């Protein structure tokens, strides 16, 4: 219906509100962006799903995301891959570990302060019935 065609709609707009917050922190500079094949050339092959803000913008606008459930997935996929492309105990690793969890705990912690949850449970009402 348009009722939940606007519904989606809404999600998308607080998407991409949430993200654009992510993606102006300085702190998560290095995951506004593909990481580039000429600066490293294994991480295509150690990662198998990159992830970066950049195409999470890309994926809420080709409405990939019905549920604020599937978009922290890739919030936590962005995540996840930083921690294992980036494991080591030097200071560089260390850095970009640290900035991973903190982008992480940023997204959970706006979503916790401004997503209505009976908003998230319609979202996934509507996905589970289609
Ligand atoms: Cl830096």
Same mark, same amino acid.
């Given at each position: +219906?348009?009722?939940?065609?606007?519904? $989606? *709609? #809404?999600?998308?707009?607080?998407?991409? @509100?949430?993200?654009?917050?992510?993606?102006? =922190? &300085?702190? $998560?500079?290095? $995951?506004? &962006?593909?990481? /580039?094949?000429? #600066?490293?050339?294994?991480?295509?092959?150690?990662?198998?799903?990159?992830? =970066?803000? +950049?195409?999470?913008? +890309?994926?809420?606008?080709?409405? &990939?995301?019905?549920?604020? &459930?599937?978009?922290? *997935?890739?919030?936590?996929?962005?995540? +996840? @891959? !930083?921690?294992?492309?980036?494991?080591?105990?030097?200071?560089? /690793? *260390?850095?970009?570990?640290?900035? !991973?969890?903190?982008? *992480?705990?940023?997204?959970?912690?706006?979503?916790? %302060? %401004?997503?209505? %949850? =009976?908003? #998230?449970?319609?979202? #996934? %009402?509507?996905?589970?019935?289609?």
């Amino acid at each position: +219906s348009m009722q939940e065609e606007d519904t $989606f *709609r #809404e999600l998308r707009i607080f998407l991409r @509100n949430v993200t654009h917050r992510l993606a102006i =922190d &300085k702190r $998560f500079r290095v $995951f506004t &962006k593909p990481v /580039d094949p000429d #600066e490293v050339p294994d991480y295509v092959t150690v990662i198998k799903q990159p992830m =970066d803000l +950049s195409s999470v913008i +890309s994926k809420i606008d080709l409405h &990939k995301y019905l549920t604020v &459930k599937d978009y922290l *997935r890739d919030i936590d996929l962005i995540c +996840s @891959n !930083a921690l294992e492309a980036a494991p080591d105990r030097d200071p560089g /690793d *260390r850095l970009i570990r640290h900035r !991973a969890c903190a982008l *992480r705990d940023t997204a959970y912690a706006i979503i916790k %302060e %401004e997503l209505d %949850e =009976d908003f #998230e449970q319609l979202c #996934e %009402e509507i996905q589970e019935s289609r």
